[model samples]
Target chain A: QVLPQALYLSNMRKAVKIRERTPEDIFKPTNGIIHHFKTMHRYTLEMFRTCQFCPQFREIIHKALIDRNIQATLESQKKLNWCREVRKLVALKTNGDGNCLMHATSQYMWGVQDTDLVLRKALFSTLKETDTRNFKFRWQLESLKSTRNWNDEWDNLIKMASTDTPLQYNSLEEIHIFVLCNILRRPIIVISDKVGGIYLPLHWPAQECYRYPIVLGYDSHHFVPLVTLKDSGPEIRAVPLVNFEDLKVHFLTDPENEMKEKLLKEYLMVIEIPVQTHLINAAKLDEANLPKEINLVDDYFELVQHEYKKWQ
Target chain B: VLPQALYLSNMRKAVKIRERTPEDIFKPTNGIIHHFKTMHRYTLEMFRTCQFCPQFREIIHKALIDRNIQATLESQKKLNWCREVRKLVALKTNGDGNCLMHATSQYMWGVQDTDLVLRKALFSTLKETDTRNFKFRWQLESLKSCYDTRNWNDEWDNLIKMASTDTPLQYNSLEEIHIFVLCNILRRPIIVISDVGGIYLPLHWPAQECYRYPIVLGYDSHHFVPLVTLKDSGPEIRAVPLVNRDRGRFEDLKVHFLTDPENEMKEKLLKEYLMVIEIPVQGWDHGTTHLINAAKLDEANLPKEINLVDDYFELVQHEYKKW
Candidate 1:
């Protein structure tokens, strides 16, 4: 007559035993079934708890929570702000950078040290010894360093930065550093192949890190960000300034050559020069350049005010 | 003239930093980009190496190697063998249990402790958490427990060694165990739930954790399993078993209730039994019940013994040719 109560009480004892038992007890047929029921019960509770705490459920539990227009947590608020900024960046029209995500980012941070043979060897050894093949090749380092030039390059660069003809610099070497400072807005150091390779001196301590892309021109939906490197194949890869841990190994091994060749070689030649209007203003010949779309000065100044006002 | 060289060299150095740093380095612009290239390279390499290894690659590669092949190293081989054995058990005819794929190998392990008891619980548990909501709630845990027990135990290994490597098993008081075995054999489990107000236990843990199925029916296949109590409604609920983390919360709940109407009354009633019995062409129709006409089940691939219930089910179908 009281089978329900009796079974419930018995099952309760069984659940306790199942959880507390060793591998032997859990493996036993009779005990195994008991353990499963308890496990299922736990998962069910988890689902119920998740549902209960959900925002939608909260509304149902307390209508006033929704009626009053409750505020989200600080974390959520920050995410919302980020989402807005991201949208603004995407709306802008610009020639997107075309290096493999990994190589581009590495080039930005450590372009200064790629010529340091000792550092390059050490870095290469660490990365190569631990499953190095997936990462990019060091050939790009060799190729990039082949273009290093210090004399008269800065004057041309400054001019190009001021003008719309950013691509007129002709040499991939100047363009590389210019892009870092202008588009990516990052500090960079360069090294020639014989000297190893350039890199961010400050970035030396850390190794095999990765970043996510905030703005990808390729896809309208599903914005790119710091995703795991494991998922970052040729088709899907890490973007600038966002690192994911899983793909860190490639950078550790063959970081430079593995990914950079595809990145730089693909875009090194896609150059187009814009027109400029030669003019005179008072004593100085003011060259009115094409309506420069890559507005480095205006963008950097604004960004500095927002990010590093103290530096200004 | 050296600008290109300088740029190339610095790019290489940045890559070095990424290879060396282990912790989170959320730095300015270039830092993020350098880190990604290095990490992506490493992860992809690892995945390819693992996937390409002979023992691990067979499912994706579709090539068989000798048991002694270097790629068929002990650790990987065991899991692979277990997967193969589990699939075979689901395809065997009802009367062929003794000669089933599960009985042929030693890798087929035993049911996990938690899963074993879960099977018993499927005989109980209410249709709905609410006392007022009446509906036919099937006890799925029981079947899941059974499937877990059979697969995780030595029974699988034994079955694999004795019969054709690909035979399957049929009907049981513990349908979940059967389903688990069925799922492992098929390499994929896809259950379609056409009826409401009832649940079916598709498979157990270890199997569930390592594998993925589109859907799992979590209910006792037949009503022969006894119900512990009656609720306000008329659906039968079974006794609940204990588990490791939580006690069987529904242990005290009655088995049957008649509170709520089926969402799609006609559709639900028609599909109730049909969904359970009708095996899909793509998934576990282990009885070869569907393949009988195709002559896919040869003597070499048959099970050694038959469970009476499964045998009867097969006999009825065979005599009627209902499929």
Candidate 2:
């Protein structure tokens, strides 16, 4: 016997209940912010093919969303290519000690052997010398919301540099790379194995980003020197994959994708001993579809609000 | 009739609906992973706007009619369970490619866990559905975060192909029946639990009026088994872990599941994680109806337009009675 597919009648009753009321009265007990957001989302789509939801109101948000979609597509394309780039990427090994950052950076910038605290001392000098509101040597420290512990630790590291005691118990931080980037006046490209290992470039605030800069490979919790060689012709190569999926796929509550992207560069990098180069083709650049400035959704959204009200 | 039953609205309503304490509102361990929502947030937003969107209203109407037809057909007979359910409807499972098909195919008819008609019917049901629905997009989006290595697009493709045919299903390793697709196919809530957490299916897809009485099962060794309580276990042991964003009847649906006597599901259907799917009832807004024993089902004053009188009520898996 059939259970009697009566959701048809059931559906009609509910629809009648909903349509009979004003939009305000319809979701009377629903969470305030939650209901509003849901209402806006549904109302906008309704305005799409037919814009009681007007051309201006409907097209602005749709165009903005389309713009956002294209950007993400560009990002996904980069991710797929970076997969190729990381493979062709040649990782240079460096000492696994805590000073790997300095060693790698020193090796990249100095006489192939980065056996001393020279680069660390330079960072020490920069930290003591620089003055900025968003200050520090930690991952999030550059954002003005950081602890004072790192300053003291580095303050002490400077004291012991000439003594028998060597720099220990400290690893390189993300802000440190920006510091090096700031002082060096060149882009610092860090390629880590942890992430998709894109050659994400970094530079100081307002600094003009330059290409063909210092590159480093991070491994086993140690930032090692990275370089490339000319043995293979590279094509269909290199990857945003971390946050590349973020813009359009924005419904995810967990920010793990963004987290990984932020944390990837928070790892370390540098150069040194025989920073050899293979013929690395530029991860192809295209005139990616970009957002030219668009008008505010405010005025158009007013129309959406008026249009959304008529459904009541 | 269901004071003992735990439905979402009943619990809160019975708890002195006005006496919600400050302490009661602060939940430190709610099953929420984060504060943000998934695509269901958008789809649901579109759903509430049904009055304004003709396409959405059409889809909503289509899903409702499609699901109800399949539902009413299976919910015809009333059975007392002769009390196999009181002892916990003992889980009966078998190994085969059709196991995924065989596992929950029993949900089709309360009589048996048969596969022949199920494959063809399920394929036909899915065939009628399109790929652009909210569930399809949500399913694809959900897969991005899942660990199962199966290609869902192809898995869905393979599912339709296999279920469309007959004899080939038994000989070949038929596709792992996607409980999500099956849920939409039958328009019933389905949940699967394991030692790890569990996931509840989007029982009501494209429609707001949900279908209740979840078809709960266990996932073990790539096979689906009935989730019955052990001699030592309790219903509380199961918890609905990963709840989807579109908890259909969240305000009304409880974590506990009560069986439909006509379909003969066991009571105590609580699982490790809970997701809400709505089903429509005749007079009662809540999905549960006053279930009568099969014995009185003949005498009970009820309405029916059933074609079951002349139809074959085959019980090919009748051996499961002993199981």
Candidate 3:
């Protein structure tokens, strides 16, 4: 009944109950069909395409496969010197509070510390303007003013900022970043760990689609600023980070280097942060003008030589 | 299919006999009779213009023949007269306990056994009416029994008439069902003018696409009397006479009906003259040709002192009110 010969080979390798099974075991090539109990196996697999299967399984498989391919492409591009140069940036560390998103955002905008107040004010204004009738952020802003200590405040704010349940958690949305970028007139990059550590830039200028890769990476809970240094030689070499939870099935299957593989997966992701030249030019020339792209470092990594060299 | 030549010759002889009759001389042939004759002529003209199929004439002729009446009238002529005069009025027999029901059935169906089709139509509508929470199935059953027995007696009458000592199955006033039957089954717009002034049951209801004409019924002191029915432009009920416009003529007719206690003369008058007819009104485009002919007189020959503007305006309003 097996149309493809690979199905037979796949079933012989990984038999059900012969090994520890994961959620993605159904998707595994080896977990195709078994020998003795093969009567209902075809029927069960047929049922997978039926309404009996949960729709969420399809969504997970689709997203995971796509994310895996993207991550692989990004990893291959990292080996090139120019790709490495594009990835390099200076790190600006934030306080390890849940308010890392706010702290990093404020520091990126104002180039100063303790600008959470300014960030909150702008966000509240935007919330009130857009959602006047049902302004959910009013209570959060009021609570922020009375609160003395900033400990666990970010976590509480994240909890309260839920779109589904405003009473429990008023979770911040990605659109808030877009609104902030427009209001502040400064583009910002948001790195999410959910979609396999994808870097999403908000309000990027209309240019030749020249994207900068992330050179430094942080934990999902913490936020940091990547600064590009001028006239400085390449010192730090960045690596790609893998989500262990995502590749849990792969790691479990190859049990030989399970511990070593887990440790090896932990690495920093390189990211290039773009700076707006308009603000700097306005400060210098004392006139309003369109923003232009400016490279932080004059060094351009050569792809032929596979080495970092200064732009002659 | 029909004995057309024999029928036509017989009809011509009958017409000549009707003209020379003594009753024809005394009877004023002008008012309602003239109007009804004009309508009948128009219907005949329509049928003749359309060139109706032989089968259409055959069916009606056969029906008349089955009733033991000599098929003396042509298909178009008989249909026009039957639909208007003969079918319009029915005698309310006191011998039949369901006099009102029997009269109403005849008014709607025209001929006996014709109501078998109507009874089926009523039953189908009654099923839907029952679902509307009116509890009409029990009454529908009672109605069926009346149809089956060919009695249409008190049992059927009680199913419709309002609660009273005389009626045992006093469900609700049959006024609603009466309107429903006329409106839905007969597909006719109806206007019920009560005896009490300004009290019209279902004062204004719009006509539907299937509407033929507006049927006006008189509610005279617990008894229902079908008054005059009207034909109009289309399915729109507009410019309808709420109050009797020709009060003198209406009073004379009412007096005639009232004076004849035996109802002998009333039945005869109704059988002969009472009809549903479309009068030519200049307000609607349906009678534009008629209106043009009506206004064919040369304007130049008219007197200079006579204001044509006011006269024309009054004429338009008069035509409008006639509808």
lDDT by residue (tens digit), candidate 2, A18-71: 222212321212232111111211110001122344555444434432223322
| TM-scores, one per candidate | 0.17, 0.23, 0.19
Cα deviation of B286, candidate 1, in Å: 20
| Best-performing candidate as measured by lDDT | 2
Q: In model 1, which regions exceed 4 Å deviation?
A: A1-312, B1-130, B134-214, B217-270, B273-323
lDDT over C-alpha atoms for residue A87 of model 2: 23
Ranking by TM-score: 2, 3, 1
Off by over 4 Å in 2: A1-312, B1-90, B107-110, B134-156, B166-177, B203-208, B228-323
Tens-digit lDDT track of model 1 for B1-323: 11111112122222222223222212223211111112111100001113234543433223211222222222232111211111111111112232121211101111011111222211111111121111112223223223454453454334223322223333232322333333222232323111111222222212323222122111112311111011112222111111111132211111121123533353333233112122112224465332100001111211212111222222222322212
Interface RMSD of each: 31.3, 18.3, 51.8
Number of backbone-clashing residue pairs for each candidate, in the order shown: 181, 39, 16
Candidate 3: regions farther than 4 A off: A1-82, A131-173, A192-218, A233-312, B1-323
Q: Model 3 lDDT vs. the true structure?
A: 0.28
lDDT of 1 by residue, A1-312 (tens): 111111112122222222232122211124211111111111100000112234543333223111112112212333211321111110111112322222223212211111112221222223323322211232233334456463344344334323133322122233323232212222232211121122221122212111111221112111111111111123211112211111111111245447543332232211121213322110011111212121122222232222222222
Measured as a fraction from 0 to 1, the native contacts recovered by model 3 come to: 0.00
